[PDB]
Amino acid sequence: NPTKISILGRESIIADFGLWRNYVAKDLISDCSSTTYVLVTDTNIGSIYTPSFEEAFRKRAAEITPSPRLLIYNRPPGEVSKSRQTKADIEDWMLSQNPPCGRDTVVIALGGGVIGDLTGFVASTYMRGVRYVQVPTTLLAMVDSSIGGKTAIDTPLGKNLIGAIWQPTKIYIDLEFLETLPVREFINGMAEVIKTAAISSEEEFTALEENAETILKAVRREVTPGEHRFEGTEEILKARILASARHKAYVVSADEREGGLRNLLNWGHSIGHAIEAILTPQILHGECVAIGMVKEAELARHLGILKGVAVSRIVKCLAAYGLPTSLKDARIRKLTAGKHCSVDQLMFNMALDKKNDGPKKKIVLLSAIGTPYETRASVVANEDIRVVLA
Amino acid sequence: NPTKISILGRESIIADFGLWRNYVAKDLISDCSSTTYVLVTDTNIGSIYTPSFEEAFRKRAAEITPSPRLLIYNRPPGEVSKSRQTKADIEDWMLSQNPPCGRDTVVIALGGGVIGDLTGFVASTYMRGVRYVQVPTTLLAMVDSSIGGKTAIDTPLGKNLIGAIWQPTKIYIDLEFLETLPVREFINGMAEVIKTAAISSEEEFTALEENAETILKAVRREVTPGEHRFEGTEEILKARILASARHKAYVVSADEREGGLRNLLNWGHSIGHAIEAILTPQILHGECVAIGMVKEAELARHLGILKGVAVSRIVKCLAAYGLPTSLKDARIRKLTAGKHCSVDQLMFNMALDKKNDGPKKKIVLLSAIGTPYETRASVVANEDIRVVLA
Ligand SMILES: NC(=O)c1ccc[n+]([C@@H]2O[C@H](COP(=O)([O-])OP(=O)(O)OC[C@H]3O[C@@H](n4cnc5c(N)ncnc54)[C@H](O)[C@@H]3O)[C@@H](O)[C@H]2O)c1
Ligand SMILES: NC(=O)c1ccc[n+]([C@@H]2O[C@H](COP(=O)([O-])OP(=O)(O)OC[C@H]3O[C@@H](n4cnc5c(N)ncnc54)[C@H](O)[C@@H]3O)[C@@H](O)[C@H]2O)c1
Ligand SMILES: O=C(O)[C@]1(O)C[C@H](CP(=O)(O)O)[C@@H](O)[C@H](O)C1
Ligand SMILES: O=C(O)[C@]1(O)C[C@H](CP(=O)(O)O)[C@@H](O)[C@H](O)C1
Ligand SMILES: [Cl-]
Ligand SMILES: [Cl-]
Ligand SMILES: [Cl-]
Ligand SMILES: [Cl-]
Ligand SMILES: [Zn+2]
Ligand SMILES: [Zn+2]
């Protein structure tokens, strides 16, 4: 049946196959009663999933009277969509409706982290606040980006510098979206799953190690007209996803506004974001996170917290999934046409890390696979950060 | 002594004379411990009050070690400062510091509602959230705009359409700022004081009627080198201000996110903002609110809720203060060079009112001076709104 998970004192998370088709529209109209619904997505995703949804919506809004309206917004692909410019356009668009979208509006985010963050933020400030639901269409979004309530946009100086923490009213993890998820996006998302396990369960980490091959091959294996990309390994997949979703719910519920515990969910992101700011959009987020976790593991070991054995073990599991494990990686080179990451440019970007307490940089340190050094980010001197950035 | 008022379960409001001089800097460093303080203000206010403050700050940060830093930001005058452009610049500026401003930052808003809303908003989204304190320098800000936590910016389509509700950690009502407040700004602010009384206390309303002359004359009376613009009427003034501040605290505390009760604080703003969107920046906010309250009173009476007697009584008290009571007002004409407000343009703007439940416009209706018709905005048909816009 539909697996449900509670977050911040509430059953907002609902995962299962084909929710988009027969559930969302129904649930929206009952639980999220409103007169105006706005669906935000991009051109790729949209032309595939909005058509059938418009129908399921119309079917359900026939119940109501006066019947509610679903407005649809479609825009350009990539991380380019996460800017002040873009957020403004969605807003100008909403206000310019007839009538304009009021505080009753219910925004629907249908995409990965870009459409999720953008949409979540647009809602947090729209007339000071309107509800929205997350409809993750990418593995990375189902396991991490659509949960937590964290939203933002990017500025020329770094990742997610401006934004807000606005909790979504509903989160629909429709595994069925993975059926069309490109191979890279899948491996890309896989980084967050491994991350969550590496800071929570050693068992879950091992389980991820063992599933590496089976999964990665089902993702590359070509799929025929009438079967599922995840035949055979359907539950295994649901277990890996739920595991990460559930733990984030646990971490977010206990420290929603990142006062302490929520720092942990940022393992690999301190160096990761520093990298990303320089390699994006050529290098995806999950890709930059893998390299980040390895660099952070190395530092943990450098400081005597982590074990050499655990560090190399992290590496293996990442590479097992097709994730890059070093800024030197071949493709990371062919893709990053030119671009390079000096320790200076990196250190500079890490100065903009949203965890730094004042000038004291803070990074998540692992003492062993599935066990954090502290229940918060550890203050790490700049010289130490520099060495592990060889 | 320093009069303190609690809001949203907390003594964040502190009012008295000369707080800016000897208190703020001291209080900031103790209660608002931080390593980075950012003072936002404009050129007028700034060149007068920041110099002495830098000193009181330096005096207090000598205590601490490493000593914290106060960064100062100065920009253009008017409502022009309330835009996405401007908010972005303050942000780009903060991030571009050395080191950049982190989540520990403590933003200090030193200005009227423009510097207050802008600053409050910049803080609500800065790295998803940083603290800030309000330092109202205008009567309208001390009585209304710096309290509540409501912040925003304006877009080409209307007033405060984008923003957030971010509560300030401290609010410093330093009456001493009124010593230099231009006459118009004072009358301008006076509208909010009368509004708050008209939806709360009939006594307080009468008290405002009686003080009209005394106050208005002390505001016009020229002041000599060694005296106070408010000699003689010092307490009377403190009573009128506190009265409004306290009641907003009561209303905001009970319905922070405007789910019901907080609508009341928007009396005169439904038609008021609709006007404002068209007459600004030539016509101040308080000015547009006076006209709004009168038009809303007329509608209340039109609908049988309010009494003719009460309506004209509202008018008298407003005009008593120098506030305009009709879109026809002479100066409102000479100032609004050209501009006019058809019922269509107005009705259009009222479609963008952040109270409208769906398409159902909602306006605050008074049944008698100091007594609301409901503890929320009343849904008013469009045809009725049109008649009272003759
Ligand atoms: N705020 C948070 O909670 C949070 C958490 C994690 C990561 N992030 C952010 O997430 C962003 C990246 O997320 P992402 O990888 O989801 O990126 P994304 O939203 O850019 O999606 C990646 C690609 O997937 C395509 N796609 C979407 N769903 C598909 C489907 N069903 N089948 C086929 N193609 C599909 C899109 O067209 C797009 O090209 C980064 O900006 C990162 O900082 C934010
Ligand atoms: N979000 C809220 O809670 C809220 C509540 C009320 C009104 N408002 C908003 O407030 C804004 C207008 O507020 P305002 O009237 O304070 O405007 P403002 O901030 O533009 O200030 C008006 C003028 O006062 C001058 N000034 C400031 N303090 C002074 C002093 N001590 N002596 C001399 N000159 C001084 C400034 O240079 C400026 O020209 C509007 O945009 C309105 O929508 C918002
Ligand atoms: O708390 C969270 O949800 C995160 O730390 C949020 C970050 C984004 P942030 O560093 O901008 O907060 C995300 O990339 C990470 O995977 C999980
Ligand atoms: O709740 C409030 O604080 C207000 O309603 C907030 C409004 C601004 P808003 O209509 O943009 O919310 C302000 O002008 C009014 O004086 C009081
Ligand atoms: Cl709201
Ligand atoms: Cl592919
Ligand atoms: Cl924060
Ligand atoms: Cl003057
Ligand atoms: Zn991430
Ligand atoms: Zn106002």
User: Per-domain residue ranges for chain B?
Assistant: 2-180, 181-389
Are A155 and B126 inside 8 Å of each other by CB? no
Asked whether B150 lines ligand 2 (CB < 6 A), one says yes
Other beta carbons within 10 angstroms of residue B10's beta carbon come to 11
Residues 136-195 of A with CB under 8 A from B: 150, 152, 155-158, 160-165
Closest C-alpha among B192, B191, B345, B362 to residue B274: B345
Indicate the helix (H) or strand (E) that contains A31. Answer: helix A24-31
| Chain A CA closest to residue B35 | A358
Around ion ligand 5, which residues have CB less than 5 A away? A 128-129
Find the length of chain A.
390
Strand locations in chain A (E): 3-5, 13-16, 36-42, 69-75, 106-111, 131-136, 150-155, 158-165, 170-174, 362-363, 366-368, 371-372, 378-379
Give dist(CA B214, CA B105) in Å, integer: 43
Structure tokens at A31: 């639980």
Q: Show the CA angle centred on residue A337, arms to residues A336 and A343, nearest 5°.
A: 55
Q: Are B356 and B362 in contact (CB under 8 A)?
A: yes
Place of tokens 């009213």: A169
A228 is in an annotated binding site: no
- B12 annotated ligand-binding residue: no
Helix, strand, coil percentages (3-state) for chain B, rounded to 5, are: 50, 15, 35
Q: For chain B, first and last CA: distance in Å?
A: 50
**Separation in Å, CA A182 to CA A136, A221, A317:** 14, 12, 21
Q: Is B42 annotated as a binding-site member?
A: yes
Distance between CA atoms of B2 and B120, rounded to whole angstroms? 24
Q: Is A195 left (phi over 0), alpha (psi -120 to 50) or beta?
A: alpha
Structure tokens at A333: 């080179």
Question: A188, A158 in Cβ contact below 8 A?
Answer: no
Burial of residue B245, with CB atoms counted within 10 A of its CB: 0-12 exposed, 13-18 middle, 19 or more buried: buried
Q: How far is Cα of residue B227 from the mean position of the Cα atoms in its chain?
A: 27
- Give the pairing of strands A3-5 and A13-16: antiparallel
**Hey, is B233 helix, strand or coil?**
coil
Q: How far is the CA of A290 from the centre of ligand 6 (A)?
A: 20
Tell me the angle at which helices B308-320 and B202-220 cross, rounded to the nearest 10 degrees. Answer: 20
Question: What is the DSSP secondary-structure string of A35-50?
Answer: SEEEEEEEHHHHHHHH
* Residue for token pair 């439940």: B357
How far is ligand 1, taken at its centre, from the CA of residue B362, in Å? Answer: 39
For the domain spanning B2-180, the CATH number is: 3.40.50.1970
Reading the block at residue B239, the tokens are 């009573």
Q: Which tokens in the block code for residue A235?
A: 């539950």
The pairing of strands B150-155 and B158-165 is: antiparallel
Inform me whether the C-beta atom of residue A236 falls under 8 Å from chain B C-beta atoms: no
B235 classed as catalytic? no
A269 lines ligand 3 (CB under 6 A): yes
- B141 pocket-lining for ligand 2 (C-beta < 6 Å): yes
- Give the SS3 label for residue A162: strand
Instruction: Quote the tokens at residue A294.
Output: 């390895």
Omega before B99 within 30 of 0, i.e. cis: yes
Experimental method, per PDB record: X-ray
- Which CATH number is correct for B181-389, 3.10.180.10, 1.20.1090.10, 3.40.50.300, 3.30.420.40? 1.20.1090.10
Residue A373 to residues A249, A344, B11: CA-CA distances in angstroms?
20, 27, 37
Task: State whether the Cα torsion B293-B295-B297-B299 is positive or negative.
Answer: negative
A113-125 vs B113-125: helix axis angle to the nearest 10?
Answer: 150
Tell me, yes or no, if the two domains A2-180 and A181-389 fold the same way.
no
Whose tokens are 């309208």? That residue is B140
Chain pair A-B, CB pairs under 8 angstroms? 107
- Residue B26 is inside which H or E element, if any? helix B24-31
CB burial of residue B371 (10 Å; 0-12, 13-18, 19+): middle
Distance CA A94, CA A291 (A): 39
> How far is residue A166 CA from its own chain's centroid?
15
| Residue keyed to tokens 């070509």 | A222
Can you tell me the distance from the alpha carbon of B294 to that of B271, in angstroms, rounded to the nearest whole number? 9
Cα B191 to averaged position of ligand 10 atoms, centre (Å): 8
Ligand 2 atom, smallest distance to B154 CA: 41
Helices (H), chain B: 24-31, 43-61, 84-95, 113-125, 139-140, 183-198, 202-220, 234-254, 269-279, 285-302, 308-320, 330-335, 343-349, 382-387
- What whole-number distance in Å separates Cα of residue B252 and Cα of residue B273? 20
Residue pair A128/B380 in contact (Cβ under 8 Å)? The answer is no
The residue length of chain B stands at 390
- Residue labelled with tokens 């295994």: A236
Q: Which of A185, A204, A247, A273 is catalytic?
A: A273
For residue A299, which of A209, A384, A214, A374 has the smallest C-alpha distance? A384
Give the C-alpha distances (Å, rounded to integers) separating A75 from A36, A80, A134, A282, B277: 20, 10, 17, 19, 29
Breaks (C-N over 2.5 A) in chain A follow: none
Find the CB nearest A84 among B84, B351, B357: B84
Amino acid at site B276: E
Q: How far apart are CA B63 and CA B68, in angstroms?
A: 10
Could you confirm whether A273 is annotated as catalytic? yes
Give, as one character, the DSSP assignment of residue B232: S
Query: Sheet harboring A170-174: ordered strands across?
Result: A3-5, A13-16, A170-174, A131-136, A106-111, A36-42, A69-75
Quick one: which of B360, B323, B328 has its CA closest to B192? B323
Give B-chain residues touching A165 at CB under 8 angstroms. Answer: 128-129
Tell me, yes or no, if B125 comes closer than 8 A to chain A by beta carbon: yes
The three-state secondary structure class of B174 is: strand
